[PDB]
Design a binder for this molecule. Structure first.
Ligand code: HEM
Ligand code: HEM
Ligand code: HEM
Ligand code: HEM
Lengths: 146, 141, 141, 146
């Protein structure tokens, strides 16, 4: 992913305001609620029977932290997403067999969560820059499929 | 296929758009054209600049069409038949573009209606827009 | 969304299938498991070997469900409500898998009924299976 | 794309029976009929208004011949599809902006045409081998997106 310096600056500045403890869980939780089939990959996570149960599930919040961490790792090295996500790609593709459309879905759920949190600050140009990032992350995660 | 809860959620959430229909629809289009520039190919003679009055006017039509869909949510193919013939028969819009606009509509609603955009309502709105998209990309005359 | 002509094409084509419905359903499943091995993860306890009586029994259930859907093509959500709950609520089948089985059903029909599998009938069948898929991947209780 | 020796033999045996003057046009024509938005990319090809018009259109037949030729070339270069299809990928992605799901659709329409023409010979193991091939070709065409 190549961002302009202006786009990287915009993305980096916003990400500095993203709650490390919560936003990943909100995004993972909404993935599970909005696209219910994704729950099949999280049998061991306990109660996912209702939207409230999903969003309050401690394991969803904890796993979401790891997911956000990976996006964070992507942001730190936009010129080497494939290298950064190589192990994760092996896991999600070769071991778990997650259909790669779902990678796109999670990226877009994250974008919705950023818009929700930041309101008017999440301008169309800021979104456009984040869309480059989440597409890059999804492509890197799906690398073992390509 | 929408659940009764989906229809309730959509009617309530979309109902808050009101006189902001043009504004929100225009913002969603602007988000789409900027984030996914391939979509501009369908509007070769439009002024697609920031703040364009033409995009503002088009945003109102899209939003009003969604109001129409809500008011006919149990019988959408008959209510949207003209729009289906436009988008599927005349313009031949690739279905992927409907996912892109739908996403940008969700982003716009999330940015403007923080209290409404709960996980449950998010889910219902996504299904609703997917249903509308299926109708507009189908040829069923 | 199916056109009136689509529904006629589907009824005529599936009618020609007739008593081979079960055999064809089993063949489509076998084609899916072999061509798209990830789909086997939904049947972890199944005998999936070639000639499997279990796969043959399941193919008949799939075909009979399609026959039901053809008979209720105007009212598929109501007709398929139990099956939707099974696939979307209980089994949580990823929607990509329905595209894979739908394709394998078309391949099976093409291989057995080449005269019947005209471009128009191919088109209508693809739309029909997409419509069924949308119902089975939707939670609408 | 790796094929077992048994798969390679079976793929080659079936392809030798393909009518190279017709099958590409049948595949391209059925794409245009079954997935009608794809017609937008072929506005200059004349009458596409009915299935009969599409399937009998000389430009559809002529262009299908080129498409089949690309598949035929791919069969001889299964270990280097990204290389072989680089020029075509740039054309379809960078110039034409064809959404890559359509590459998957065309490959599967081709599989349906082979099933139509060869019936009992197009066994499930033969299909499975061809699915590997058309997935490889779609992936290589989509490379500029990855
Ligand atoms: C698209 C961006 C995604 C990112 C950045 C991401 C990131 C991660 C990370 C960091 C882990 C932990 C790896 C480890 O502990 O070694 C993980 C595990 C996992 N991911 Fe994701 N993921 C993504 C998409 C998805 C999707 C869409 C699904 C399913 C629909 C999924 C299913 C899983 C599962 C099942 C696990 C293992 C959970 C367990 O430990 O039981 N991932 N992912
Ligand atoms: C929720 C989805 C959509 C809705 C509700 C919608 C609604 C509408 C409406 C109401 C119109 C004006 C109809 C008229 O003038 O009578 C229109 C026109 C149009 N739409 Fe959409 N649309 C949607 C998705 C899309 C997408 C995804 C695209 C392409 C990326 C698209 C491309 C167009 C074009 C090119 C026109 C005609 C513009 C012109 O030349 O005047 N639409 N749409
Ligand atoms: C045209 C699409 C489909 C139709 C008509 C269909 C129909 C059926 C029917 C009739 C049953 C038997 C239910 C019962 O009698 O209790 C069933 C069960 C099942 N289906 Fe499907 N199905 C479709 C697609 C799929 C797909 C794509 C998958 C996964 C790849 C899938 C996975 C399953 C599983 C795991 C079961 C339960 C098997 C068991 O007994 O353990 N289905 N389906
Ligand atoms: C998936 C397998 C595909 C293969 C093997 C393939 C192959 C080819 C080839 C060999 C050409 C001629 C290149 C040249 O003349 O330099 C071509 C051109 C073209 N392709 Fe495809 N293609 C595929 C998919 C698609 C799809 C799905 C579309 C969607 C519409 C598409 C749209 C076009 C167009 C518009 C042209 C140019 C036609 C013209 O000259 O006006 N292709 N393709």
């Amino acid at each position: 992913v190549h961002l302009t310096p202006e786009e990287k600056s915009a993305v980096t500045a916003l990400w500095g305001k993203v709650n490390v403890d919560e936003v990943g869980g909100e995004a993972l939780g909404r993935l599970l609620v909005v696209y219910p089939w994704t729950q099949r990959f999280f049998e061991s996570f306990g109660d996912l029977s209702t939207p409230d149960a999903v969003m309050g599930n401690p394991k969803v919040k904890a796993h979401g932290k790891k997911v956000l961490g990976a996006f964070s790792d992507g942001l730190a090295h936009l010129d080497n997403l494939k290298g950064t996500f190589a192990t994760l790609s092996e896991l999600h593709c070769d071991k778990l067999h997650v259909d790669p459309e779902n990678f796109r879905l999670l990226g877009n759920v994250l974008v919705c969560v950023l818009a929700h949190h930041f309101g008017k600050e999440f301008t169309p140009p800021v979104q456009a820059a984040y869309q480059k990032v989440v597409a890059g992350v999804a492509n890197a995660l799906a690398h073992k499929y390509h | 296929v929408l659940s009764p809860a989906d229809k309730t959620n959509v009617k309530a959430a979309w109902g808050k758009v009101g006189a902001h229909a043009g504004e929100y629809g225009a913002e969603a289009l602007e988000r789409m054209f900027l984030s996914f520039p391939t979509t501009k190919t369908y509007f070769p003679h439009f002024d697609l600049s920031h703040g364009s009055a033409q995009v503002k006017g088009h945003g109102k039509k899209v939003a009003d069409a969604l109001t129409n869909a809500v008011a006919h949510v149990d019988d959408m193919p008959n209510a949207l038949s003209a729009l289906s013939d436009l988008h599927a028969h005349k313009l031949r819009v690739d279905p992927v573009n409907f996912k892109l606009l739908s996403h940008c509509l969700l982003v716009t609603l999330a940015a403007h209606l923080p209290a409404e955009f709960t996980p449950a309502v998010h889910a219902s709105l996504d299904k609703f827009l997917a249903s509308v998209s299926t109708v507009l990309t189908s040829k069923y005359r």
